[PDB]
Amino acid sequence: MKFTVEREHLLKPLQQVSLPILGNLLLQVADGTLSLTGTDLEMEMVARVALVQPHEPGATTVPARKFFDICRGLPEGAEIAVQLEGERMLVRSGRSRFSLSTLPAADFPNLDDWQSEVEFTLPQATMKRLIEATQFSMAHQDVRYYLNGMLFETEGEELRTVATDGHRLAVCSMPIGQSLPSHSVIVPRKGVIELMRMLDGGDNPLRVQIGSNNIRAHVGDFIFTSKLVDGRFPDYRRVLPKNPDKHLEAGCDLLKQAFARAAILSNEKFRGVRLYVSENQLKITANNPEQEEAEEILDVTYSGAEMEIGFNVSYVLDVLNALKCENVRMMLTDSVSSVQIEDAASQSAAYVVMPMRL
């Protein structure tokens, strides 16, 4: 196995593809192409790079981090010559020489073979929007294992993501211009993060294939495959407040800064803040067990009945930071119901926070 490639043509693939063999990358030279594969047994990334210089076929595995670090450590645009020599992989560029340990390509694990059952193509930016809108609301390491990921749902002509930690919920729906079967799957949280970072911000379309227990995403030279979480996800429809009758609109940043200052004097563990809404005015209060107290008053747009409501300010600040927009809509019912929060200029993403009695 032999190949010579420019440093930069390896770095992006290396970043994407990054028991001992799990710490190695599979390298394969075949039919004019170097393939690089990383895996943790749950998910796998394959990156292809065209070989324009002379090369010789073959396959091995090499320590991922050390190989990455050597390549990154070489000078910008350096030529990197790689060949197998015995049980070692030789790396040479200029007068820099490296000899790395190998493990047999035969020992590199494959994900189980599977069949694609639902497929669609969408712009990368659309998938990025869907994931970014909801990612922060996934659970991390909850005993409810099915919350440690993101629901991907197809319905009519749209793709939807849902994330919840069992306390707050995020949902985002986007039309993708293709007739889809009604379907939903759970992508493990590590898989969501890996998928997100494979999206490079460019013009390559994204092709998604979903099987019974797997998902695959293809963008340009990269192919990501993950197991799905085998479980049942909560129904977001039952979480959204039914027909909320009271709408407040305010500048996102003004609202966020008011909440952020109030949060300083909220309970450190439970983070409860109170809202008092009246004609075109919002008052936010916070207090803590040391009996310190914050109050914020700001102009908003509101004409409904006067009401009060408490919430976890961390959850609300999470929403406002995710929204990054000009204006926000808080959809209210009463002191004993959840709130729905949206970009005032878009119904694509919605966020639900539970009420607190303070």
Is residue 312 a contact point for Ca ion (CB under 5 A)? no
- Residue closer to a copy of itself by CB (options 195, 328) is 328
Contact partner, 134, from Ca ion, a copy of itself, none, Cβ < 5-8 Å per class: none
Q: Does residue 115 belong to the site contacting Ca ion (CB under 5 A)? A: no
Shortest separation between residue 248's beta carbon and Ca ion, angstroms: 19
With CB under 5 A, what is the number of residues at the site for Ca ion? 15
Tell whether residue 96 is a contact of Ca ion (CB under 5 A): no
Q: Report the 3 state secondary structure along the chain.
A: CEEEEEHHHHHHHHHHHCCHHHHEEEEEEECCEEEEEEECCCEEEEEEEECCCCCECEEEEEEHHHHHHHHHHCCCCCEEEEEEECCEEEEEECCEEEEEECECHHHCCCCCCCCCCEEEEEEHHHHHHHHHHHHHHCCCCCCCHHHCEEEEEEEEEEEEEEEECCCCEEEEEEEEEEEEEEEEEEEEHHHHHHHHHHCCCCCCEEEEEECCCEEEEEECCEEEEEECCCCCCCCHHHCCCCCCCEEEEEEHHHHHHHHHHHHCCCCCCCCEEEEEEECCEEEEEEECCCCCEEEEEEECECCCCCEEEEEEHHHHHHHHHHHCCCEEEEEECCCCCCEEEEECCEEEEEEEECCECC
| Closer residue to a copy of itself, CB minimum distance, 99 or 116 | 99
**Smallest distance, Å, CB 252 to a copy of itself?**
15
| Nearest approach, Cβ of residue 89 and a copy of itself (Å) | 10
Which residues form the interface with a copy of itself (CB under 8 A)? 66, 69-70, 73-75, 88, 95-101, 257-258, 260-261, 264-265, 290-298
Exactly one of 115, 179, 182, 291 binds Ca ion (CB under 5 A); which one?
182
Shorter beta-carbon distance to Ca ion: residue 236 or 302: 236
Q: What residues make contact with Ca ion under the rule CB under 5 A?
A: 76-77, 97, 99, 153, 155-156, 173, 182, 203, 272, 286-287, 293, 295
Mark the binding-site residues for DNA, compressed into ranges: 65, 141, 145-146
